[PDB]
Coordinates of C-alpha atoms and ligand atoms in Angstrom, one line a residue:
Chain U
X1291 CA 0.0 0.0 0.0
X1292 CA 1.0 3.7 -0.4
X1293 CA 2.9 2.9 -3.6
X1294 CA 1.0 4.9 -6.2
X1295 CA 2.2 5.4 -9.8
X1296 CA 1.5 9.1 -9.4
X1297 CA 4.3 9.5 -6.9
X1298 CA 6.7 7.6 -9.1
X1299 CA 5.9 9.7 -12.2
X1300 CA 6.5 12.9 -10.1
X1301 CA 9.8 11.5 -9.1
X1302 CA 10.9 11.1 -12.7
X1303 CA 9.8 14.6 -13.4
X1304 CA 11.1 16.3 -10.3
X1305 CA 14.7 15.3 -11.1
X1306 CA 15.2 15.7 -14.9
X1307 CA 14.1 19.2 -15.9
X1308 CA 36.1 16.3 -27.0
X1309 CA 36.5 12.6 -25.9
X1310 CA 33.0 11.0 -26.0
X1311 CA 34.0 8.6 -23.2
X1312 CA 35.0 11.5 -20.9
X1313 CA 31.7 13.3 -21.8
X1314 CA 29.6 10.3 -20.9
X1315 CA 31.5 9.9 -17.6
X1316 CA 30.9 13.5 -16.6
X1317 CA 27.2 13.2 -17.4
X1318 CA 27.1 10.0 -15.2
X1319 CA 28.7 11.8 -12.2
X1320 CA 26.4 14.7 -12.6
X1321 CA 23.4 12.3 -12.7
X1322 CA 24.5 10.5 -9.6
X1323 CA 23.6 13.4 -7.3
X1324 CA 20.2 13.7 -9.0
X1325 CA 19.7 9.9 -8.7
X1326 CA 19.9 10.2 -4.9
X1327 CA 17.2 12.9 -4.9
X1328 CA 15.2 10.7 -7.3
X1329 CA 15.3 7.8 -4.9
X1330 CA 14.2 9.9 -1.9
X1331 CA 11.1 10.8 -3.9
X1332 CA 10.2 7.1 -4.3
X1333 CA 7.7 6.3 -1.5
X1334 CA 9.2 4.2 1.4
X1335 CA 12.7 4.3 0.1
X1336 CA 13.7 6.9 2.7
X1337 CA 12.0 5.0 5.5
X1338 CA 14.5 2.2 5.0
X1339 CA 17.6 2.2 7.2
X1340 CA 20.5 4.3 5.8
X1341 CA 22.7 1.2 5.5
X1342 CA 20.2 -0.4 3.0
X1343 CA 19.8 2.9 1.1
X1344 CA 23.5 2.8 0.4
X1345 CA 23.5 -0.8 -0.7
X1346 CA 20.5 -0.4 -3.0
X1347 CA 21.9 2.8 -4.6
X1348 CA 25.5 1.4 -5.0
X1349 CA 24.0 -1.8 -6.3
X1350 CA 21.7 -0.3 -8.9
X1351 CA 23.1 3.1 -9.9
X1352 CA 24.4 1.9 -13.2
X1353 CA 21.2 0.3 -14.4
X1354 CA 19.2 3.2 -13.0
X1355 CA 21.2 5.6 -15.2
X1356 CA 21.4 3.5 -18.2
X1357 CA 17.6 3.2 -18.1
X1358 CA 17.2 7.0 -17.8
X1359 CA 19.4 8.2 -20.6
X1360 CA 18.1 5.4 -22.8
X1361 CA 14.4 6.6 -22.5
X1362 CA 15.7 10.2 -22.9
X1363 CA 17.2 9.2 -26.3
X1364 CA 14.0 7.8 -27.7
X1365 CA 14.0 10.7 -30.2
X1366 CA 17.7 10.4 -31.2
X1367 CA 18.3 8.6 -34.5
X1368 CA 21.5 6.6 -33.8
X1369 CA 22.9 7.9 -30.6
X1370 CA 22.0 9.1 -27.1
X1371 CA 21.2 12.4 -25.3
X1372 CA 23.4 13.1 -22.3
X1373 CA 22.3 14.9 -19.1
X1374 CA 24.7 17.7 -20.1
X1375 CA 22.4 18.2 -23.1
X1376 CA 25.1 17.0 -25.4
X1377 CA 24.7 14.2 -28.0
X1378 CA 26.8 11.1 -28.7
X1379 CA 26.3 9.4 -32.1
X1380 CA 26.9 5.7 -32.9
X1381 CA 30.0 6.5 -35.0
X1382 CA 31.5 8.7 -32.3
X1383 CA 31.1 5.9 -29.8
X1384 CA 32.7 3.5 -32.2
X1385 CA 35.6 5.8 -32.7
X1386 CA 36.2 5.7 -29.0
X1387 CA 36.6 2.0 -28.6
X1388 CA 33.1 1.3 -27.1
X1389 CA 31.1 0.6 -30.3
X1390 CA 29.8 -2.8 -29.2
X1391 CA 28.3 -1.8 -25.8
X1392 CA 27.0 1.4 -27.2
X1393 CA 25.1 -0.5 -30.0
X1394 CA 23.7 -3.0 -27.4
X1395 CA 22.2 0.1 -25.7
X1396 CA 20.6 1.3 -28.9
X1397 CA 19.3 -2.1 -30.0
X1398 CA 18.2 -3.7 -26.7
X1399 CA 17.1 -0.6 -24.9
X1400 CA 16.6 2.7 -26.7
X1401 CA 15.1 1.3 -29.9
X1402 CA 12.9 -1.0 -27.9
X1403 CA 11.6 1.7 -25.5
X1404 CA 10.7 3.7 -28.6
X1405 CA 9.0 0.9 -30.5
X1406 CA 6.6 0.2 -27.6
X1407 CA 6.4 3.9 -26.8
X1408 CA 7.3 3.3 -23.1
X1409 CA 5.9 6.3 -21.1
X1410 CA 7.5 8.1 -18.2
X1411 CA 5.3 6.3 -15.6
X1412 CA 6.4 2.9 -17.0
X1413 CA 10.0 3.9 -16.9
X1414 CA 9.7 5.2 -13.3
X1415 CA 8.2 2.0 -12.1
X1416 CA 10.9 0.0 -13.9
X1417 CA 13.6 2.0 -12.2
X1418 CA 11.8 1.7 -8.8
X1419 CA 11.8 -2.1 -9.3
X1420 CA 15.6 -2.0 -10.0
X1421 CA 16.1 0.3 -7.1
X1422 CA 14.3 -2.2 -4.7
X1423 CA 16.6 -5.1 -5.6
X1424 CA 16.3 -7.7 -2.8
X1425 CA 19.2 -9.7 -4.1
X1426 CA 21.6 -6.9 -3.1
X1427 CA 24.2 -8.2 -0.6
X1428 CA 24.5 -6.7 2.8
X1429 CA 20.8 -5.7 3.1
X1430 CA 19.7 -5.9 6.8
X1431 CA 16.1 -6.8 5.9
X1432 CA 15.9 -8.2 2.3
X1433 CA 12.3 -9.1 3.1
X1434 CA 11.0 -5.5 3.2
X1435 CA 13.0 -4.6 0.1
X1436 CA 11.2 -7.5 -1.6
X1437 CA 7.8 -6.3 -0.3
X1438 CA 8.4 -2.8 -1.8
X1439 CA 9.4 -4.3 -5.2
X1440 CA 6.1 -6.3 -5.3
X1441 CA 4.0 -3.2 -4.6
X1442 CA 5.8 -1.3 -7.4
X1443 CA 5.0 -3.7 -10.2
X1444 CA 1.6 -4.3 -8.8
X1445 CA 0.7 -0.6 -9.2
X1446 CA 2.5 -0.7 -12.6
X1447 CA 0.4 -3.7 -13.8
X1448 CA -2.7 -1.8 -12.8
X1449 CA -1.4 1.3 -14.7
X1450 CA -0.9 -0.8 -17.7
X1451 CA -3.9 -2.6 -19.3
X1452 CA -6.0 0.3 -18.0
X1453 CA -3.9 2.8 -19.9
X1454 CA -3.3 0.3 -22.7
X1455 CA -6.4 -2.0 -22.9
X1456 CA -5.3 -3.2 -26.4
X1457 CA -2.0 -4.5 -25.0
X1458 CA -2.5 -7.3 -22.4
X1459 CA 1.2 -8.2 -22.5
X1460 CA 2.6 -4.7 -22.2
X1461 CA 3.4 -5.2 -18.5
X1462 CA 5.3 -8.5 -19.0
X1463 CA 7.1 -6.8 -22.0
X1464 CA 8.4 -4.1 -19.7
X1465 CA 9.8 -6.5 -17.1
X1466 CA 11.4 -8.5 -19.9
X1467 CA 13.8 -5.6 -20.6
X1468 CA 15.3 -5.9 -17.2
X1469 CA 17.5 -8.9 -18.1
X1470 CA 19.0 -6.9 -21.0
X1471 CA 19.5 -3.9 -18.6
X1472 CA 21.3 -6.2 -16.1
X1473 CA 23.7 -7.6 -18.8
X1474 CA 24.4 -4.1 -20.4
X1475 CA 24.8 -2.5 -16.9
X1476 CA 27.4 -5.3 -16.1
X1477 CA 29.3 -4.6 -19.3
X1478 CA 29.3 -0.9 -18.6
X1479 CA 30.9 -1.6 -15.2
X1480 CA 33.7 -3.7 -16.7
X1481 CA 34.5 -0.8 -19.1
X1482 CA 34.6 1.8 -16.3
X1483 CA 36.9 -0.3 -14.1
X1484 CA 39.3 -0.7 -17.0
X1485 CA 39.2 3.0 -17.6
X1486 CA 40.0 3.7 -13.9
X1487 CA 42.9 1.2 -14.0
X1488 CA 44.5 2.7 -17.1
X1489 CA 44.5 6.2 -15.7
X1490 CA 43.2 8.0 -18.8
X1491 CA 39.7 9.4 -18.9
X1492 CA 38.9 11.9 -16.1
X1493 CA 36.6 10.4 -13.5
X1494 CA 34.8 12.7 -11.1
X1495 CA 34.5 12.2 -7.4
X1496 CA 31.0 10.7 -7.2
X1497 CA 31.5 8.3 -10.1
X1498 CA 34.8 7.4 -8.6
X1499 CA 33.2 6.6 -5.3
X1500 CA 30.7 4.1 -6.9
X1501 CA 33.7 2.3 -8.3
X1502 CA 35.1 1.8 -4.8
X1503 CA 34.9 -1.5 -2.9
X1504 CA 33.1 -3.6 -2.0
Chain B
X1014 CA 33.6 4.8 3.3
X1015 CA 31.1 5.9 0.7
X1016 CA 31.5 9.5 1.9
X1017 CA 29.5 11.4 -0.8
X1018 CA 26.6 8.9 -0.9
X1019 CA 26.0 9.1 2.9
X1020 CA 26.1 12.9 3.0
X1021 CA 23.6 13.2 0.2
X1022 CA 21.2 10.6 1.7
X1023 CA 21.3 12.2 5.1
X1024 CA 20.7 15.8 4.0
Chain C
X735 CA -1.7 -19.4 -30.5
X736 CA -0.7 -23.0 -30.2
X737 CA 1.6 -22.3 -27.2
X738 CA -0.1 -24.3 -24.4
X739 CA 1.4 -24.8 -21.0
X740 CA 0.6 -28.5 -21.3
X741 CA 3.1 -28.9 -24.1
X742 CA 5.8 -27.1 -22.1
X743 CA 5.3 -29.2 -19.0
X744 CA 5.6 -32.4 -21.1
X745 CA 8.9 -31.0 -22.5
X746 CA 10.2 -30.6 -18.9
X747 CA 9.2 -34.2 -18.1
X748 CA 10.1 -35.8 -21.4
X749 CA 13.8 -34.9 -20.9
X750 CA 14.7 -35.3 -17.2
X751 CA 13.6 -38.8 -16.1
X752 CA 36.8 -36.2 -7.3
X753 CA 37.0 -32.6 -8.4
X754 CA 33.6 -30.8 -8.0
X755 CA 34.3 -28.5 -10.9
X756 CA 35.1 -31.4 -13.2
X757 CA 31.9 -33.1 -12.1
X758 CA 29.7 -30.1 -12.7
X759 CA 31.2 -29.7 -16.1
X760 CA 30.5 -33.3 -17.1
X761 CA 26.9 -32.9 -16.0
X762 CA 26.7 -29.8 -18.1
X763 CA 28.0 -31.6 -21.2
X764 CA 25.6 -34.5 -20.6
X765 CA 22.7 -32.0 -20.2
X766 CA 23.5 -30.2 -23.4
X767 CA 22.3 -33.2 -25.6
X768 CA 19.1 -33.3 -23.6
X769 CA 18.6 -29.6 -23.8
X770 CA 18.5 -29.8 -27.6
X771 CA 15.8 -32.5 -27.3
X772 CA 14.0 -30.3 -24.8
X773 CA 13.9 -27.4 -27.2
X774 CA 12.5 -29.5 -30.0
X775 CA 9.6 -30.3 -27.7
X776 CA 8.8 -26.6 -27.2
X777 CA 6.1 -25.7 -29.8
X778 CA 7.2 -23.7 -32.8
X779 CA 10.9 -23.9 -31.9
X780 CA 11.6 -26.5 -34.5
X781 CA 9.6 -24.6 -37.2
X782 CA 12.2 -21.8 -36.9
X783 CA 15.1 -21.8 -39.4
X784 CA 18.0 -24.0 -38.4
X785 CA 20.3 -20.9 -38.2
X786 CA 18.1 -19.3 -35.5
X787 CA 17.8 -22.5 -33.6
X788 CA 21.6 -22.5 -33.3
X789 CA 21.7 -18.9 -32.2
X790 CA 19.0 -19.3 -29.6
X791 CA 20.6 -22.4 -28.1
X792 CA 24.1 -21.1 -28.1
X793 CA 22.8 -17.9 -26.7
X794 CA 20.8 -19.3 -23.8
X795 CA 22.2 -22.8 -23.0
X796 CA 23.9 -21.6 -19.9
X797 CA 20.9 -19.9 -18.4
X798 CA 18.7 -22.9 -19.5
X799 CA 20.8 -25.3 -17.6
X800 CA 21.4 -23.2 -14.5
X801 CA 17.6 -22.8 -14.2
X802 CA 17.1 -26.6 -14.6
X803 CA 19.5 -27.9 -12.0
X804 CA 18.5 -25.1 -9.7
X805 CA 14.9 -26.2 -9.6
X806 CA 16.1 -29.8 -9.3
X807 CA 18.0 -28.9 -6.1
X808 CA 14.9 -27.4 -4.3
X809 CA 15.1 -30.3 -1.9
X810 CA 18.9 -30.1 -1.3
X811 CA 19.9 -28.3 2.0
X812 CA 23.0 -26.3 1.0
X813 CA 24.1 -27.6 -2.4
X814 CA 22.8 -28.8 -5.8
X815 CA 21.8 -32.1 -7.4
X816 CA 23.7 -32.8 -10.7
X817 CA 22.2 -34.6 -13.7
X818 CA 24.6 -37.4 -13.0
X819 CA 22.6 -37.9 -9.8
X820 CA 25.6 -36.7 -7.8
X821 CA 25.6 -34.0 -5.1
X822 CA 27.7 -30.9 -4.6
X823 CA 27.6 -29.1 -1.3
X824 CA 28.3 -25.5 -0.5
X825 CA 31.6 -26.3 1.3
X826 CA 32.8 -28.6 -1.5
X827 CA 32.2 -25.7 -4.0
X828 CA 34.0 -23.4 -1.8
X829 CA 37.0 -25.7 -1.5
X830 CA 37.2 -25.6 -5.4
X831 CA 37.6 -21.9 -5.8
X832 CA 34.0 -21.1 -6.9
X833 CA 32.3 -20.4 -3.5
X834 CA 31.0 -17.0 -4.5
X835 CA 29.1 -18.0 -7.7
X836 CA 27.9 -21.2 -6.1
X837 CA 26.4 -19.2 -3.2
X838 CA 24.7 -16.8 -5.6
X839 CA 23.0 -19.8 -7.2
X840 CA 21.8 -21.0 -3.8
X841 CA 20.6 -17.6 -2.6
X842 CA 19.2 -16.0 -5.8
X843 CA 17.9 -19.0 -7.5
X844 CA 17.5 -22.4 -5.6
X845 CA 16.3 -20.9 -2.3
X846 CA 13.9 -18.6 -4.1
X847 CA 12.4 -21.3 -6.3
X848 CA 11.8 -23.3 -3.1
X849 CA 10.3 -20.4 -1.1
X850 CA 7.7 -19.7 -3.7
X851 CA 7.3 -23.4 -4.5
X852 CA 7.8 -22.8 -8.3
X853 CA 6.3 -25.8 -10.1
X854 CA 7.5 -27.6 -13.2
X855 CA 5.1 -25.8 -15.5
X856 CA 6.3 -22.4 -14.3
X857 CA 10.0 -23.4 -14.7
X858 CA 9.3 -24.7 -18.2
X859 CA 7.6 -21.5 -19.3
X860 CA 10.5 -19.5 -17.8
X861 CA 13.0 -21.6 -19.8
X862 CA 11.0 -21.2 -22.9
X863 CA 11.0 -17.5 -22.5
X864 CA 14.8 -17.6 -22.1
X865 CA 15.1 -19.9 -25.1
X866 CA 13.1 -17.4 -27.2
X867 CA 15.5 -14.5 -26.6
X868 CA 14.9 -11.9 -29.4
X869 CA 18.0 -10.0 -28.4
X870 CA 20.2 -12.8 -29.6
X871 CA 22.6 -11.5 -32.3
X872 CA 22.4 -13.0 -35.8
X873 CA 18.7 -14.0 -35.7
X874 CA 17.3 -13.7 -39.2
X875 CA 13.8 -12.8 -38.0
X876 CA 14.0 -11.4 -34.4
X877 CA 10.4 -10.5 -34.9
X878 CA 9.0 -14.0 -34.8
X879 CA 11.3 -14.9 -31.9
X880 CA 9.7 -12.0 -30.0
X881 CA 6.2 -13.2 -31.0
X882 CA 6.9 -16.6 -29.6
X883 CA 8.2 -15.2 -26.3
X884 CA 5.0 -13.2 -25.9
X885 CA 2.8 -16.3 -26.3
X886 CA 4.8 -18.2 -23.7
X887 CA 4.4 -15.7 -20.9
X888 CA 0.8 -15.1 -22.0
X889 CA 0.0 -18.8 -21.4
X890 CA 2.1 -18.7 -18.2
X891 CA 0.2 -15.7 -16.8
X892 CA -3.1 -17.6 -17.4
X893 CA -1.6 -20.7 -15.8
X894 CA -0.7 -18.6 -12.8
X895 CA -3.6 -16.7 -10.9
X896 CA -5.8 -19.6 -12.0
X897 CA -3.6 -22.2 -10.3
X898 CA -2.7 -19.6 -7.6
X899 CA -5.7 -17.3 -7.0
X900 CA -4.2 -16.1 -3.7
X901 CA -1.1 -14.8 -5.5
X902 CA -1.8 -12.0 -8.0
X903 CA 1.9 -11.2 -8.3
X904 CA 3.3 -14.7 -8.7
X905 CA 3.6 -14.2 -12.4
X906 CA 5.7 -11.0 -12.1
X907 CA 7.7 -12.7 -9.4
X908 CA 8.7 -15.4 -11.8
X909 CA 9.8 -13.0 -14.5
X910 CA 11.8 -11.1 -11.9
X911 CA 14.2 -14.0 -11.4
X912 CA 15.4 -13.7 -15.0
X913 CA 17.7 -10.7 -14.2
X914 CA 19.5 -12.8 -11.6
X915 CA 19.6 -15.8 -14.0
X916 CA 21.2 -13.5 -16.7
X917 CA 23.9 -12.2 -14.2
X918 CA 24.7 -15.6 -12.7
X919 CA 24.8 -17.2 -16.2
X920 CA 27.3 -14.5 -17.3
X921 CA 29.5 -15.2 -14.3
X922 CA 29.4 -18.9 -15.0
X923 CA 30.6 -18.2 -18.5
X924 CA 33.6 -16.2 -17.3
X925 CA 34.6 -19.1 -15.0
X926 CA 34.4 -21.7 -17.8
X927 CA 36.4 -19.6 -20.2
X928 CA 39.1 -19.2 -17.6
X929 CA 39.1 -23.0 -17.0
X930 CA 39.5 -23.7 -20.7
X931 CA 42.3 -21.2 -20.9
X932 CA 44.3 -22.7 -18.0
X933 CA 44.1 -26.2 -19.4
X934 CA 43.1 -28.0 -16.2
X935 CA 39.6 -29.3 -15.7
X936 CA 38.5 -31.8 -18.4
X937 CA 35.9 -30.3 -20.8
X938 CA 33.9 -32.6 -22.9
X939 CA 33.2 -32.1 -26.7
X940 CA 29.7 -30.5 -26.5
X941 CA 30.5 -28.2 -23.7
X942 CA 33.7 -27.3 -25.5
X943 CA 31.7 -26.4 -28.6
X944 CA 29.5 -23.9 -26.8
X945 CA 32.6 -22.1 -25.6
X946 CA 33.6 -21.6 -29.3
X947 CA 33.3 -18.4 -31.2
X948 CA 31.5 -16.2 -31.9
Chain P
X394 CA 31.4 -24.6 -37.2
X395 CA 29.0 -25.7 -34.4
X396 CA 29.3 -29.4 -35.6
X397 CA 27.6 -31.1 -32.7
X398 CA 24.8 -28.6 -32.3
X399 CA 23.7 -28.8 -36.0
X400 CA 23.8 -32.6 -36.1
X401 CA 21.6 -32.9 -33.0
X402 CA 19.0 -30.3 -34.3
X403 CA 18.8 -31.8 -37.8
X404 CA 18.2 -35.4 -36.5
Ligands
9RA1128 C1 26.2 4.7 -16.9 C2 26.5 5.5 -17.9 C3 25.8 6.7 -18.1 C4 25.0 7.2 -17.1 C5 24.2 8.4 -17.2 C6 24.3 9.1 -18.4 C7 23.5 10.4 -18.7 O1 23.9 11.2 -19.5 O2 22.4 10.4 -18.0 C8 25.2 8.7 -19.4 C9 25.9 7.5 -19.3 C10 27.5 5.1 -18.9 C11 27.1 4.5 -20.0 C12 28.1 4.1 -20.9 C13 29.5 4.3 -20.6 C14 29.8 5.0 -19.4 C15 28.8 5.4 -18.6 C16 29.2 6.1 -17.3 C17 30.6 3.9 -21.6 C18 31.2 2.6 -21.1 C19 31.7 4.9 -21.6 C20 30.0 3.7 -23.0 C21 28.9 2.7 -22.9 C22 27.7 3.4 -22.2 C23 27.0 4.4 -23.1 C24 26.7 2.3 -21.9
9RA1129 C1 26.0 -24.4 -16.3 C2 26.4 -25.3 -15.3 C3 25.7 -26.5 -15.1 C4 24.8 -27.0 -16.0 C5 24.0 -28.1 -15.8 C6 24.3 -28.8 -14.6 C7 23.4 -30.1 -14.3 O1 23.9 -30.9 -13.5 O2 22.3 -30.1 -14.8 C8 25.2 -28.4 -13.7 C9 25.9 -27.2 -14.0 C10 27.5 -24.9 -14.5 C11 27.3 -24.3 -13.3 C12 28.3 -23.9 -12.5 C13 29.6 -24.1 -13.0 C14 29.8 -24.8 -14.2 C15 28.8 -25.2 -15.0 C16 29.0 -25.9 -16.3 C17 30.9 -23.7 -12.1 C18 31.4 -22.4 -12.7 C19 31.9 -24.8 -12.2 C20 30.5 -23.5 -10.7 C21 29.3 -22.5 -10.6 C22 28.1 -23.1 -11.2 C23 27.5 -24.2 -10.2 C24 27.0 -22.0 -11.5

């Protein structure tokens, strides 16, 4: 209870008003501060113990951001729109050594969100589900985190069907993008760690912190 | 550890 | 249409009647031959072009097998039951250098399938969904693969709720184990590749083939 | 390539 899709949508709206790799990294760092604010706007998130709020954010920040800029790029032809309002095209990503992962973002996420015309309410519920990941290690009470996740997709399921009566399977379709998001989020992390190791590519404070241990 | 993250969540 | 849960269940039943790493690998190789037979029993799978049947199997074999032995181990305390009828306990996996990934299997998959008492029909539909992965690269007609996937979870959704009226969110719960399956399947692949590289650990012909390129 | 896989699918 007390997990309405109206609150989630508001959250999504309340936050988002020369090297391409360095640009994408600065946008990520900038979006991390906003991500925290976003999470606080998701009902019940703040009522959880601070220790679990840290685990959930550190555990899902990457997928939370990939999902956001992906939906934001729905109007971009072959590229993505960065928080800094700057663009990154397929060719530019390819010329930076990250062509493969960039394309997976376009094919598995961006293009798909556009084809099904995923709305901001659906995106928010998806992100809230990711946020409330009960598999996160360290959680003091993985039970409550699981309870929250269930309420999110429950309100989402109701939102769907009602908003899209012609599409009985729209709900399941949404959830089925999560496996791709997990995989793509994991590949993004491997890249980042390598970048940090090498030394090149400027990495801001907040983004650097997420790459810390554990 | 996790300096930044804690400060932002607390405020 | 023509994607009944009765056919899927049958498929699940029609197939499954000293180094722990070497034992798990031999069980995997043995299960790969059966996996192919299993897939042929899933309606429409065989009607797809041979080229896509290869892509879908090579793309999801790992998650298909992880999901099978996980559900088979539902009765095991802290370990798993191998196709060879042999057991592998948590401590034994730890003493082999794969404690972490093994535990993730127990916590994110096995223990969860048991808590919700996932039945064989649910497992089969889940595996069929994984099998019909439209994100697989190379697919000649990713559209039809997507159509098949939709019919699977559609019949699953109907199976659920009806079989479990008290659990409105059981369906979504099932689909939400797929992200963990993806992640755990990916980690399993990294291990295997390393094993192959090193040279130790006997790897049978079929399992060796899956580790080929692309 | 993919010898085994093709043979099993075809039969
Ligand atoms: C998580 C990423 C991210 C997060 C937020 C944004 C944003 O602009 O909102 C952009 C990018 C991100 C995404 C990527 C990257 C690096 C990062 C930091 C690299 C690995 C540089 C290229 C591949 C993709 C595009 C997936
Ligand atoms: C895909 C695996 C697999 C597949 C099928 C079975 C089976 O007995 O049915 C057992 C194991 C598998 C699973 C694992 C492994 C290796 C393999 C080949 C290693 C990496 C050896 C340990 C971690 C886990 C248990 C996830």
